[PDB]
Design a protein around this nucleic acid. Sequence first.
RNA 1: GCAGGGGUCGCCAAGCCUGGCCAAAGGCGCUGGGCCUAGGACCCAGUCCCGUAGGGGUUCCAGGGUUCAAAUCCCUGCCCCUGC
Length: 333
Amino acid sequence: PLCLKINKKHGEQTRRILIENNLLNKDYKITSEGNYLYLPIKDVDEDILKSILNIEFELVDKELEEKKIIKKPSFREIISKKYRKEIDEGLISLSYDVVGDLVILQISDEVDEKIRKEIGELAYKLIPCKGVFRRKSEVKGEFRVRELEHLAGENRTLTIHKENGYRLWVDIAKVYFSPRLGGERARIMKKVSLNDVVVDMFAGVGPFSIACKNAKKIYAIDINPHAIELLKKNIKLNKLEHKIIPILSDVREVDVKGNRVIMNLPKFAHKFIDKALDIVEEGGVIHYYTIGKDFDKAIKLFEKKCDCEVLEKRIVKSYAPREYILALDFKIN
RNA sequence: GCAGGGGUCGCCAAGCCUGGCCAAAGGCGCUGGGCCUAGGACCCAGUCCCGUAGGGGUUCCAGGGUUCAAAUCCCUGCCCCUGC
Ligand SMILES: C[S@@+](CC[C@H](N)C(=O)[O-])C[C@H]1O[C@@H](n2cnc3c(N)ncnc32)[C@H](O)[C@@H]1O
Ligand SMILES: [Mg+2]
Ligand SMILES: [Mg+2]
Ligand SMILES: [Mg+2]
Ligand SMILES: [Mg+2]
Ligand SMILES: [Mg+2]
């Protein structure tokens, strides 16, 4: 539409200025005819333009040059405006998880299924994925899985996830995985000492183990057959066939010792402090996870257990208003 | 290497065809602040570097080069996973 014909010699320098005074119309693209450039501009006058532009220019009334070029908004952008109220009532969430090429939203079932489908639709439209789900139930069961409800894109739950350089087969509907724990996996990764024997008591599809590939031997344990199938595919996928030993079993009845022991089962980890201390060697170290309103009982209930030494204590994430997931590493003597 | 793919601001991942509101979307992580509950959460803000800002300085694996203008186009040094 309202263009500003200028010589290309001053294109960039002109665009810059026009952008600072916020005049460059952002709906159309800068076309070009010869030694000139047409720069879509918002309605202003010749003199105020002459003031901010140290050069010659015509306000040619060129043709639209096409039609508006919309800036694809962000899922968050649109969803924020359209539903601030229930986002504020806790029915729709702006945060979401993405595992491989699958996204998992959070929408309360109090919200209508038609809306949930439309929102799952925006997500598919506006977010780089192949499929969209939402959390159907909470994390429950001994396998620690959750119900999902497909909403858009492919109805698939198998995908490959990347974090810290490695890749992982994950079926978000048959096992427990949190893309959110990648940083946690990263710390511990810079601790494995190539001659360490690691015990992953609740290995899942194996992300913690794989993050400990430096060590000598790794023992990935898990009672969930579905988890073990994947764990195995990931060992091969990561060419770690001879460092990680998958073990379909209840950790309780497994005889292994190790200097590095991981207990990622924050809900019922306390029910296993014993079996760990067992597996862990004299000088060994046990990475323990749990929940609580604070670190108290976490350390209090480990004291009356052994010659421990709180190597490092931190907060992973709020579990609910107040309750937190904590990670303590213990030095055994 | 004859259907040929890839390295983007901690980890992921948009953009690249078609150069121009790109310091570069989102998610996660990290920081601060709310939230007695969506329970392995959720809301607000920040997150390349300097500033209170306006703005400035440096980035898209590393050079060179084309362009008024390059993460986007062109020969090219190192590295990596699918391959009538
Ligand atoms: C929290 S998940 C591991 C998640 C993984 N660290 C992640 O976030 O990517 C817990 C795993 O522990 C397993 N598990 C629970 N109890 C177990 C037991 N008694 N013996 C062996 N495995 C068990 C479950 O089957 C489940 O796969
Ligand atoms: Mg509430
Ligand atoms: Mg807080
Ligand atoms: Mg544009
Ligand atoms: Mg640029
Ligand atoms: Mg600042």
